[PDB]
Amino acid sequence: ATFEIVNRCSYTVWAAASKGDAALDAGGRQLNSGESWTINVEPGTNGGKIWARTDCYFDDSGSGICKTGDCGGLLRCKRFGRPPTTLAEFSLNQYGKDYIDISNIKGFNVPMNFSPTTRGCRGVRCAADIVGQCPAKLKAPGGGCNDACTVFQTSEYCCTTGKCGPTEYSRFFKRLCPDAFSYVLDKPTTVTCPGSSNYRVTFCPTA
Numbered sequence: 001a002t003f004e005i006v007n008r009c010s011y012t013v014w015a016a017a018s019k020g021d022a023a024l025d026a027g028g029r030q031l032n033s034g035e036s037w038t039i040n041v042e043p044g045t046n047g048g049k050i051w052a053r054t055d056c057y058f059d060d061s062g063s064g065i066c067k068t069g070d071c072g073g074l075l076r077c078k079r080f081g082r083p084p085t086t087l088a089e090f091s092l093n094q095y096g097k098d099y100i101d102i103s104n105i106k107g108f109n110v111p112m113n114f115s116p117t118t119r120g121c122r123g124v125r126c127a128a129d130i131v132g133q134c135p136a137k138l139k140a141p142g143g144g145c146n147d148a149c150t151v152f153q154t155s156e157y158c159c160t161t162g163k164c165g166p167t168e169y170s171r172f173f174k175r176l177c178p179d180a181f182s183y184v185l186d187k188p189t190t191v192t193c194p195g196s197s198n199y200r201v202t203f204c205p206t207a
Contacts, residue, residue, distance in 0.1 A: 003201060008203060018048070024042075056075075069084075084150070085108075086104065089102070097194065098116075100191050101191065102179065118197045148170065158184075
């Protein structure tokens with residue numbers, strides 16, 4: 001499956017793609033304002049994620065750090081990134097269908113649109129100014145808006161017992177972005193697409 005990653009932000013971002021225990025395609029790459037990077041993800045990929053990283057510095061070997069979404073200090077991500085990270089999430093070819101969503105469960109750093117480039121389903125988007133409107137206690141000094149689990153580490157925010165409800169903090173993310181997961185047990189906003197669909201992830205979609 002092809003995923004065209006486009007940076008419409010006025011600032012540079014370092015795209016990342018991983019399934020948690022391995023990179024997807026090259027795993028990561030710099031995207032200056034306006035640049036597009038197309039990656040290929042193997043059919044059947046389960047639990048894949050794509051996100052943007054901001055304010056990164058990498059040496060010649062591809063090692064360094066980013067203020068948001070850092071994945072073990074590597075340019076080419078092999079693991080998931082450090083919150084806050086707005087997440088484009090997908091599981092492909094799961095019993096004949098593709099499943100996609102956007103999640104704020106791990107916080108929000110950059111606005112995003114995640115849409116199919118093929119027929120059969122609709123896209124999802126979270127492009128509100130969550131960082132600007134972020135509740136004081138969730139603001140990340142390093143940049144972005146942290147999710148409450150990251151900040152407070154409680155069973156309720158992290159849904160560790162599998163029994164949690166919405167919270168004042170999750171409701172904030174849900175208010176700004178109704179179409180993205182605001183907490184673990186949020187009413188699903190996952191979209192079902194035809195198996196083997198192709199997609200486009202656009203950072204800063206409304207610009």
